[PDB]
Every structure is written in C-alpha cells, then in structure tokens.
C-alpha cells in the first residue's frame, strides 16, 4: 500500500464540501498527480473507489492512480488536469459560443453515456466537476454522488447533487434513473451559452428549489433555434419526455438532435476533433489555471483532534488501500 510519506505536497488546488484537493508528486517516479483528501468525520467508499477504477479506462474521465488512508482522512490519488475546470474558465469568459458549448457538452455526453451504460449515475454534473486538459479537451471528476449497480430499469431515491443542478424528479421525491444526468447537462449547457444559470437570474435555497420546479426557463433571443430546442429538450420538467431519457433510444436521440448534428461523435470519442479553446498553461505546473483562493492557502494538512478522531468507526475503511496495476 502507498502512503503520505511517498508523496510530495506541492500546492492546494481545490476545495469542496467533502474534500480538499492538493497538487502532489510521487517522490519515487517524479510523476505529477492530484490528491483528493476526504476527512472521515463527514464520511459510498465501495462506489467512489470502484467508479474511479472504471474511469481510468476512458478519455473523458479522471482516472485513479492509488488509494490510501490515514487515521483521520481518506486519500484519492488521481490524474492532474492542468487546465483548470469549467467554472474557473467561465467566470473569465462569462459566456461561450454555441460552437464551443456544443464541443464540451458532446464530450461530456460521451463520458456520461459510458457511465450510463456501465450502470453508474453521475448525479453531480456541474462546472466544478468538469476539467480542461492541457490540449483543450474535458475530463469528469468528483464521483461522490455516483450510484452503482443500475441494471436496466432500476431507479434510486437518494436526494443528492448540487442545489442548482438537481433535477425536478428528485425535488418531487420521485424515483429516478439516468434522467438526472441529462437534466444537469441541460442546466450546464444553459450556463455555457446564456452565461447565467437558468434558475439564478421557503426563501433562499428552497426558493431555488421551487424555481427549479415552478419557474419557466426563458431562453434569450440571441440563441439559435437549434440551441433553444436543445435546452428545452434537456430542461423538460417531465423525465419521460426529456431528451436522452428515451429507453433504448436515449443516446441516439441526443446524437440526432439538430444541435448535435454535423458533429462526428466517433472522431470526438477518439479525441480527433480540434478543441475551440486551448488553455494557457501559465505558472508552475499550470497553476495559474486554478483559483488563487486555494493556491494561496498554506500547503499542509490540517492538524488532528484526538478527541474527534477517536470516534471514527475504522471498521468501515478496511480495504481502502489500493494501487492501480496499469
């Protein structure tokens, strides 16, 4: 098993609700990785590990290098995507052309299908969870909400995801399948092209929840008819009527839609399409592509509290140690 003593701590590159992501280097082999550090007081474990395993054999998914744990934390050594995420690259761009959004959402669609056809529901597709690589493509990370074991026709009932991206099915307490990932892609595509969440522009987070359920998505007049229809078909409140939520004909419907026409999906799956935007790898390790609110934090791990860490049931993390064998 690997350990904290075998990795060099370079920079803090990310923070979320569950983990702190650090830029690391394996000291033995000089390779550069990212390390997702999850504290066990918040903490699945069967699912997030096993999903990082699958994702290692795909071009648009973040792969798993090794897994190890400490008395207080869980560590995920994964790939390092040195172009940043879509959120960072959206607060600067503010709005994307339809040609660009079509490129990213197509690559996301392929990655999502690969998950869908393996029995996994991403259930957390957002700007933060999509990363740009050095060449300009995308990769999906953070499988904390992922579901596992969906044999054809199964549904789950877990209320989870990002507040802005939760599908109405979840908000109505219904059982749901892969339909929730194409809703999030709809909300994501709306953000790329409109430049704003379709739900932002009982009273502040439950206000959003009612908006997501009761308000109507208003497409700006500057968008095309194909862009408008691809958002209205992805943001359809009825999961049985939504685009991609068509039993057997799901992905084919997404590939046949006017917006996703003239697109070569087999060249795209083979990384043969030319990205519209190539990240400007500036700074050490391309760290100028990450927010300075994290890369200015002291590069260290937060001290432990023997009174808090003595309550953790360590008989649930028994087989977390893992090293990917190529």
């Amino acid at each position: 098993s690997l350990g904290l003593q075998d990795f060099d701590l370079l920079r803090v590159i990310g923070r979320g609700s569950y983990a702190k992501v650090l830029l690391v280097r394996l000291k033995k082999t000089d390779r550069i990785y990212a390390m997702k550090v999850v504290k066990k007081e918040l903490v699945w474990v069967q699912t997030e590990k096993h999903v990082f395993e699958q994702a290692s054999n795909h071009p648009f998914l973040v792969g798993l290098h090794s897994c190890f744990q400490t008395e207080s934390r869980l560590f995920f050594v994964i790939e390092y995507v040195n172009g940043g995420d879509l959120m960072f690259h959206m607060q600067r761009q503010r709005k994307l052309p339809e040609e660009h959004a079509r490129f990213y959402s197509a690559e996301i669609s392929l990655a999502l299908n690969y998950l869908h056809e393996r029995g996994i529901i991403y259930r957390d597709l957002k700007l933060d969870n999509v990363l740009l690589d050095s060449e300009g493509h995308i990769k999906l990370t953070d499988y904390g909400m992922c579901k596992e074991g969906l044999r054809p026709g199964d549904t789950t009932s877990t209320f989870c995801g990002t507040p802005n991206y939760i599908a109405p099915e979840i908000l109505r307490g219904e059982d749901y399948g892969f339909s929730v990932d194409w809703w999030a892609l709809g909300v994501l595509m709306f953000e790329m092209m409109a430049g704003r969440s379709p739900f932002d522009i009982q009273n502040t987070e439950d206000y959003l929840f009612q908006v997501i359920l009761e308000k109507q998505i208003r497409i700006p007049r500057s968008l095309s008819v194909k862009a408008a229809s691809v958002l209205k078909s992805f943001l359809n409140k009825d999961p049985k009527e939504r685009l991609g939520c068509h039993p057997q004909t799901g992905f084919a419907d997404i590939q046949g839609h006017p917006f996703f026409r003239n697109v070569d999906w087999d060249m795209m799956e083979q990384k043969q399409v030319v990205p519209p935007f190539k990240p400007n790898i500036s700074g050490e390790f391309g760290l100028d592509n990450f927010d300075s609110q994290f890369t200015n934090e002291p590069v260290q791990l937060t001290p432990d509290d023997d009174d808090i860490v003595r309550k953790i049931d360590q008989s649930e993390f028994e087989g977390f140690e893992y090293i990917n064998p190529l």
């Binding site: 569950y18 959206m90 607060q91 957390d124 957002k126 700007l127 909400m145 989870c160 990002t162």
Partner: peptide, 13 residues
C-alpha cells in the same frame, strides 16, 4: 467576492 458563477458545494441527505 462577487462573480458571475459561484462555486456550489454538493449536498446529500
């Protein structure tokens, strides 16, 4: 800070 898109953390309950 004030930004166009705001970082949102995932929720699970």
């Amino acid at each position: 800070r004030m930004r166009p898109f705001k970082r949102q953390g995932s929720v699970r309950r």
